[PDB]
Ligand SMILES: CCCCCCCCCCCCCC(=O)SCCNC(=O)CCNC(=O)[C@H](O)C(C)(C)COP(=O)(O)OP(=O)(O)OC[C@H]1O[C@@H](n2cnc3c(N)ncnc32)[C@H](O)[C@@H]1OP(=O)(O)O
């Protein structure tokens with residue numbers, strides 16, 4: 087059933103996943119020396135290319151591939167349109183490895199055919215709390231704690247094959263070459279997410295959406311008017327009213343994050359993320375990179391009163407191309423990023439996120455039910471979507487966890 091995934095060091099079934107009691111590697115121990123120096127073989131009409139994603143023109147080339155060929159729905163109504171500025175931010179965080187950005191071009195004219203990207207992340211991925219209990223009950227605490235130390239691994243994203251080259255087994259070759267490059271740097275695990283079900287997720291969560299511009303969402307068929315609104319003389323008026331938000335934030339002392347906030351934000355974020363089984367560890371430089379405001383990319387606000395930062399939230403922008411509506415070309419989505427609340431309830435913090443996103447012309451706010459996102463779903467009028475996000479590791483056995491035990495946001 088899986089000619090490629092059956093050959094890789096990942097759990098092969100749910101049944102197998104059910105028998106996993108400790109975090110740890112799947113594959114044989116290996117060294118950099120064991121890994122082929124030469125690129126993985128590829129057909130003579132293609133070549134490997136390493137784009138420089140700090141170079142505008144190379145970012146533009148990858149941007150076009152994704153714009154035209156990246157994830158879309160089944161009815162081909164919307165396709166993600168990650169911006170050039172967003173790609174540079176996502177793919178060049180502190181201490182990234184240029185070699186982990188892998189492309190295929192056709193040798194002749196140099197058309198870009200495929201891409202995959204890895205970036206470093208420092209991740210807590212030791213045995214989860216509920217399994218450390220099981221291990222205590224069995225007298226197996228030492229084995230359960232072996233991999234407790236945060237690990238420097240690879241996060242994979244942006245896998246894409248050109249539409250004209252689909253179902254030709256190019257994706258496996260891209261994955262093998264990426265794994266080689268990562269392994270040549272003495273890194274042996276990766277983390278990735280996908281909507282599709284592959285062997286085998288360690289966690290899955292549904293997507294949730296919060297309408298900000300319902301009239302446009304209905305126009306482009308992102309949304310429909312729910313049946314109950316038909317009992318009203320003016321269904322759309324009632325829908326707009328239902329999703330109306332304040333025009334300015336409600337929390338006193340809300341303001342954009344600045345460089346001087348980085349230590350406080352790192353403190354409160356890392357204290358909060360510790361509570362979850364799987365989550366990132368960020369340095370100051372990583373907090374700066376992922377959270378300082380960046381125009382059209384990432385938006386981050388802190389609550390500061392009486393000279394102390396007590397709370398923050400962040401969101402990032404991913405637009406989508408609206409395929410052949412006559413009124414609109416673009417869907418402007420805000421996604422819930424990291425946050426931490428110490429002074430106010432989470433719903434009160436995130437309401438200000440919706441208010442700012444609406445103020446700035448976003449059409450919808452999206453998120454997965456990771457972190458404590460379920461805690462403000464109903465009050466803030468989010469609803470579940472049809473999509474899931476499944477979380478995977480490469481070369482890491484891991485017990486199934488609930489999505490509310492995952493604290494890694496994947497872009
Ligand atoms: C230590 C370091 C390790 C680093 C690596 C860690 C692994 C990272 C793994 C990648 C994480 C990516 C995270 C993201 O970016 S998820 C976003 C992925 N991108 C898209 O959905 C964009 C639009 N679609 C496409 O570009 C293509 O359809 C892709 C490229 C997705 C497949 O191309 P194509 O349709 O032309 O097929 P093929 O003939 O070449 O290949 C067929 C094989 O590919 C398996 N397949 C299909 N979709 C995915 C998928 N999303 N992840 C992993 N595998 C996938 C499929 O089961 C089959 O294998 P098997 O079932 O036969 O066994």
Ligand SMILES: CN1CCC(N(C)c2nc(N(C)CCC#N)c3ccccc3n2)CC1
Pocket residue numbers: 157158159160163164165166281307308309404406419452471473
């Ligand atoms: C019936 N219906 C089905 C589409 C529609 N939707 C919610 C939707 N939107 C997708 N994109 C690219 C843009 C979403 C954002 N932000 C998508 C991508 C991949 C897989 C499914 C998907 N579904 C919701 C309305």
Ligand SMILES: CN1CCC(N(C)c2nc(N(C)CCC#N)c3ccccc3n2)CC1
Pocket residue numbers: 157243244279280281282293404452471473474475496497
């Ligand atoms: C790796 N990766 C891929 C794009 C993903 N994404 C931004 C995303 N994905 C949606 N689906 C259904 C999973 C698609 C896949 N692969 C989605 C649905 C509705 C609204 C927004 C949405 N956003 C996020 C991370």
Ligand SMILES: [Mg+2]
Pocket residue numbers: 247251252253254255256257
């Ligand atoms: Mg292919």
